[PDB]
Ligand binder design. Sequence first.
Ligand SMILES: Cc1cc(/C=C/C#N)cc(C)c1Nc1ccnc(Nc2ccc(C#N)cc2)n1
Ligand SMILES: OC1NC=Nc2cccc(F)c21
Ligand SMILES: [Mg+2]
Lengths: 556, 415
Amino acid sequence: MVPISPIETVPVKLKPGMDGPKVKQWPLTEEKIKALVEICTEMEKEGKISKIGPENPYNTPVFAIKKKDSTKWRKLVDFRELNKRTQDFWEVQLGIPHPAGLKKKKSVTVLDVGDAYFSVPLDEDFRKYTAFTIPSINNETPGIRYQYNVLPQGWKGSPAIFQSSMTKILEPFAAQNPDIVIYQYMDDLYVGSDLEIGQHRTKIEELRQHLLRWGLTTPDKKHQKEPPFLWMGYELHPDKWTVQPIVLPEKDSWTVNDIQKLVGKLNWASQIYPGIKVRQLSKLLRGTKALTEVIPLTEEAELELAENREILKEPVHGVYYDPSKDLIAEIQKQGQGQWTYQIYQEPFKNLKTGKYARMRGAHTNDVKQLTEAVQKITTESIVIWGKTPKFKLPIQKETWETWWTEYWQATWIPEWEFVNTPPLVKLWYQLEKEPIVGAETFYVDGAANRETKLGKAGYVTNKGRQKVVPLTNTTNQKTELQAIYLALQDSGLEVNIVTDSQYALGIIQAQPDKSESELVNQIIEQLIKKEKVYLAWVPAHKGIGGNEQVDKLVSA
Amino acid sequence: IETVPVKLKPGMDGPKVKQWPLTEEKIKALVEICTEMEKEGKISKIGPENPYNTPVFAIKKKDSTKWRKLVDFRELNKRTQDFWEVQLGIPHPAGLKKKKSVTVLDVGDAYFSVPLDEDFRKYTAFTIPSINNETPGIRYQYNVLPQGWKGSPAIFQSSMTKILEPFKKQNPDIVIYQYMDDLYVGSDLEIGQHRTKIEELRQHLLRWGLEPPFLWMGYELHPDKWTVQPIVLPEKDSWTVNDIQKLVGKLNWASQIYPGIKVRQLSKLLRGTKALTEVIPLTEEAELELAENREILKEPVHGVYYDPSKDLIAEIQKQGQGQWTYQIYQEPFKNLKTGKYARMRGAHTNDVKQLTEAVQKITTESIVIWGKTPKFKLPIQKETWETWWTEYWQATWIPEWEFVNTPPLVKLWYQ
Ligand SMILES: Cc1cc(/C=C/C#N)cc(C)c1Nc1ccnc(Nc2ccc(C#N)cc2)n1
Ligand SMILES: OC1NC=Nc2cccc(F)c21
Ligand SMILES: [Mg+2]
């Protein structure tokens, strides 16, 4: 025989203070017991389990399940209880590669490593916790007791320890063969290269020979799986990728559940189909989670769906990444807080696409949303490609400069250029830095009675213009905004406005262009029509002329 | 050479912090650094039975081209037992902030000479990610005191005091304070003298070492010249209604800090409903009230004391044109330090880089004055900061921060 290197065991512990499982074995039919005994005799012959004496106090239940449409039974050891008591492990598969970050490959071969799995020994000191019992025929002898010597299927640590054991075996091969890539998924190794097929097949044989150093055999009759690969919802081909087919159902009426499934499909599709939208369809899911409830589709939701069906009418593919080329990201505004983007290197050949939706919030504006979208694409790009794309944005350079130099927060967008494709992001209003000479001055105020919710809003001006409006079902905050609105309504194109409302100033200084408050929206529409507006704040109740008078008129 | 036993705080597991996305250049740098650290025995590969993690990235220190590994041990530092066994603490030197020059040395390479307690090492686990997660992240843990962990200066302290005895005895007027991986060395000598004493100091550590990659550097400060921002009111010959309104607003705000501030007589100038740009003559009663307020504002704030048991809070405002104001306090309206920057280096078209530099300068001031870092209230959206701050960071510590989403009215008063 040829010596083989052992696979180093991973030391394993139970969580602190916990003991192993002691779970009752269910009674089984005479038929199932005979099947399990034969199954375990074979597993024992292969070294996977060993019989144990009666001292071991642990137990996990075992079942026999009929493999459908076959007379062959299959064994199932139910490790749910041991798994609760087993330590946590490092899970390497948490982040999965995105196809758009892969590199084109001339050949990709698959190798079955299912047999290696059972060359992976279980830590000797943990094996006792894996004990199980085949019940005896008629319960007239002790059940046969076994424990595992290898990683059990269904045990919490088996995926992480198998992957870490295979990676350690593979590392020297990969390091010394930088002209291939190797990826492990389930019981398969995928090996890709750009070598001419003869050299590529040579590397495969060399890999098989490396694996034999650990006694790991791979099937000669080469794998049936060949490009294209169905993997994690994608189709991988040698020189392009896409999502597996996206089929939106026809339906006469839609359930909560149906709409959740539809939105999930659209979201999946949006990584390569440009322009997908889900706002109106997601609006239908607001608040409710009665999975069987039917929701009428708004007209707006029907148009969104129809637009999506059209996008999905024929296949679209992405290209893979060429590290020798820059990455470009282009963004478009779609409306209703929705943004879409494409990432490419050569014109018209996207690596991937995607979308971004406005964050929930009271007030917002397009520049902030565009900035957030940029920040999201940047981070996604670092994950996939390790670098920030150059951005093509629908905002003039002068608009951005005006925005960031005057905005109260620090803000930044990385290297970008203007793309003149409507709709353009613009600043809808900008407040003055100084009081306006020659513009009338409006001193505004409002107040409300907390119990009756009656209030007043109004203004007085240096020209003697005055207004007070009685309001019902209102609050101090609302009346303070109503007063500013009235001043904007009744003033000329240039106006100075004096308020004592810290609330209103906080809103306006955030520079919204759209709000959940219809009063804020009305204020914004008035601001857009002005040529100049200066908003001045003063402290309340301090004897400030103008302010004192209007406060008196509105608190009456 | 023998390990100090280290524990986490009671009822407290190890850190499990996600690794954030790294650029290709930072990954390649970390792979090269960690391959060498591993050869030198400072770190070792770990297996999947270690589920812990602390983020890592890489920086370039001020004025260098070589990458430095920076581990973000903020979570591990919170979870690590406090170190009072030999000393309740190193009473912070109040004289350090009084020296004419303070030079900051990166001495963290010395920590690598002390082994870390074998039972604690698992908690220092970190991962070098791969682009697109195409290969398994490279997993390591420390075998020696790590840079950036709060235990390292504590455990090394005995060794450091002994290394420095000859220099201290020979130069008794020098203040030497250690904070995490930094050594702060303050003198009142002429800078050419000063630089030479600093180099004298390096040699003691080069000597003891027998090479440290950033020990040769020196960050030069001058705290005796550090400026503050008292409250000042305008001096004008022509006051508009708007000017007086802004003055009354500022004085109202100041009256929360200073008791005896009055605005009655100033408010009285505005009687009526006047145009904002109209000029108003000050009455005598108003000029007197204003003068009295000016005099109040020349005095210190009452009842301001530092409590070492409370967090320091730092607030920053963007003022425009590269200017930034800030306040450090523990209780509202009781500022311990205020200040203002403008010299924002190589960042004229980048707000975030400027803010990141301000955060580092304020932290440095905080370390020098109180020996700990403040919690920042940053005027930036979380997602913007988190995407970019690591690109501009040059310090070997990292403070805590939160985000300000509503514009503060008080920015106006610090202008
Ligand atoms: C992540 C991954 C999944 C699969 C396979 C998963 C499964 N099933 C196969 C491989 C080889 C990889 N690894 C890498 C790494 C770098 N570039 C590539 N490019 C690449 C991969 C497959 C095809 C094809 N056809 C084309 C290019 N793959
Ligand atoms: O999440 C997914 N993963 C893979 N394929 C999909 C297909 C349709 C919807 C969907 F959510 C997914
Ligand atoms: Mg009022």
